[PDB]
Design an enzyme around this catalytic site. Structure first.
Site, PDB file in Angstrom:
ATOM      1  N   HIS A  12      24.320 -33.366 -13.511  1.00 45.55           N
ATOM      2  CA  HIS A  12      24.559 -32.276 -12.573  1.00 45.55           C
ATOM      3  C   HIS A  12      23.385 -31.690 -11.821  1.00 45.55           C
ATOM      4  O   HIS A  12      23.611 -30.863 -10.960  1.00 45.55           O
ATOM      5  CB  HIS A  12      25.252 -31.109 -13.295  1.00 45.55           C
ATOM      6  CG  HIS A  12      26.565 -31.472 -13.910  1.00 45.55           C
ATOM      7  ND1 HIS A  12      27.636 -31.906 -13.167  1.00 45.55           N
ATOM      8  CD2 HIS A  12      26.992 -31.429 -15.195  1.00 45.55           C
ATOM      9  CE1 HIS A  12      28.659 -32.136 -13.965  1.00 45.55           C
ATOM     10  NE2 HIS A  12      28.297 -31.847 -15.199  1.00 45.55           N
ATOM     11  N   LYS A  41      33.697 -42.137 -12.897  1.00 43.50           N
ATOM     12  CA  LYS A  41      33.974 -40.711 -13.071  1.00 43.50           C
ATOM     13  C   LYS A  41      34.593 -40.213 -11.763  1.00 43.50           C
ATOM     14  O   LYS A  41      34.002 -40.391 -10.700  1.00 43.50           O
ATOM     15  CB  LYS A  41      32.692 -39.930 -13.408  1.00 43.50           C
ATOM     16  CG  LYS A  41      32.974 -38.479 -13.802  1.00 43.50           C
ATOM     17  CD  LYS A  41      31.682 -37.720 -14.155  1.00 43.50           C
ATOM     18  CE  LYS A  41      32.045 -36.311 -14.636  1.00 43.50           C
ATOM     19  NZ  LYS A  41      30.866 -35.416 -14.795  1.00 43.50           N
ATOM     20  N   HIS A 119      27.803 -27.694 -19.655  1.00 47.26           N
ATOM     21  CA  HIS A 119      29.069 -28.150 -19.047  1.00 47.26           C
ATOM     22  C   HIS A 119      29.184 -27.461 -17.706  1.00 47.26           C
ATOM     23  O   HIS A 119      28.841 -26.269 -17.596  1.00 47.26           O
ATOM     24  CB  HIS A 119      30.247 -27.786 -19.973  1.00 47.26           C
ATOM     25  CG  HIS A 119      31.590 -27.735 -19.305  1.00 47.26           C
ATOM     26  ND1 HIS A 119      32.297 -28.868 -18.955  1.00 47.26           N
ATOM     27  CD2 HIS A 119      32.397 -26.679 -18.995  1.00 47.26           C
ATOM     28  CE1 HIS A 119      33.449 -28.515 -18.401  1.00 47.26           C
ATOM     29  NE2 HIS A 119      33.537 -27.192 -18.426  1.00 47.26           N
ATOM     30  N   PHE A 120      29.570 -28.213 -16.678  1.00 45.58           N
ATOM     31  CA  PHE A 120      29.818 -27.633 -15.374  1.00 45.58           C
ATOM     32  C   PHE A 120      31.313 -27.335 -15.327  1.00 45.58           C
ATOM     33  O   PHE A 120      32.125 -28.249 -15.415  1.00 45.58           O
ATOM     34  CB  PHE A 120      29.447 -28.625 -14.262  1.00 45.58           C
ATOM     35  CG  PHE A 120      29.448 -27.997 -12.919  1.00 45.58           C
ATOM     36  CD1 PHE A 120      30.637 -27.919 -12.168  1.00 45.58           C
ATOM     37  CD2 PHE A 120      28.282 -27.418 -12.422  1.00 45.58           C
ATOM     38  CE1 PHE A 120      30.640 -27.272 -10.932  1.00 45.58           C
ATOM     39  CE2 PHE A 120      28.289 -26.781 -11.180  1.00 45.58           C
ATOM     40  CZ  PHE A 120      29.466 -26.717 -10.453  1.00 45.58           C
ATOM     41  N   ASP A 121      31.704 -26.069 -15.165  1.00 39.90           N
ATOM     42  CA  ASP A 121      33.131 -25.765 -15.234  1.00 39.90           C
ATOM     43  C   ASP A 121      33.846 -25.769 -13.876  1.00 39.90           C
ATOM     44  O   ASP A 121      34.948 -26.340 -13.739  1.00 39.90           O
ATOM     45  CB  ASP A 121      33.345 -24.417 -15.945  1.00 39.90           C
ATOM     46  CG  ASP A 121      34.700 -24.330 -16.627  1.00 39.90           C
ATOM     47  OD1 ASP A 121      35.077 -25.287 -17.339  1.00 39.90           O
ATOM     48  OD2 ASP A 121      35.382 -23.314 -16.449  1.00 39.90           O
TER      49      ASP A 121
END
EC number: 4.6.1.18
Length: 124
Positions: A12, A41, A119-121
């Protein structure tokens, strides 16, 4: 093994460029960060800010995560991001992405000591 914090940086973080380089940005980047190795992905966001600026989001606005956990944080300021989205014609192992540049607030989940993004939400 690769830690969750390091996995976040690989998936990210792209502090090298100020914004989405080109129409080809996502194709090059999803491959080089190993996001197309086992499957394509389908969606991934890259953030074009310094690591310190993104780690700082863990002390910004506490919001609920999509999954119902409460360890998500929203940035107060907008950030430069690129969304990579799989094209209809994409078929593994020749994954293909649309590259879209935006300026949005990011939401990340944070864990650990030190408390860092894992974590990228969402972006909003």
């Amino acid at each position: 093994k690769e830690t969750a914090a390091a996995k976040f940086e690989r998936q990210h973080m792209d502090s090298s460029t100020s914004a989405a380089s080109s129409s080809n940005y996502c194709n090059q980047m999803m491959k080089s960060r190993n996001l197309t190795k086992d499957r394509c992905k389908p969606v991934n966001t890259f953030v074009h800010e310094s690591l310190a600026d993104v780690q700082a989001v863990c002390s910004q606005k506490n919001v609920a995560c999509k999954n119902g956990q409460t360890n998500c944080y929203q940035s107060y300021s907008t950030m430069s991001i690129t969304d990579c989205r799989e094209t209809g014609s994409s078929k593994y192992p020749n994954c293909a992405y649309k590259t879209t540049q935006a300026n949005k607030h990011i939401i990340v989940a944070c864990e650990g000591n030190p408390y860092v993004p894992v974590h990228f939400d969402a972006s909003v």
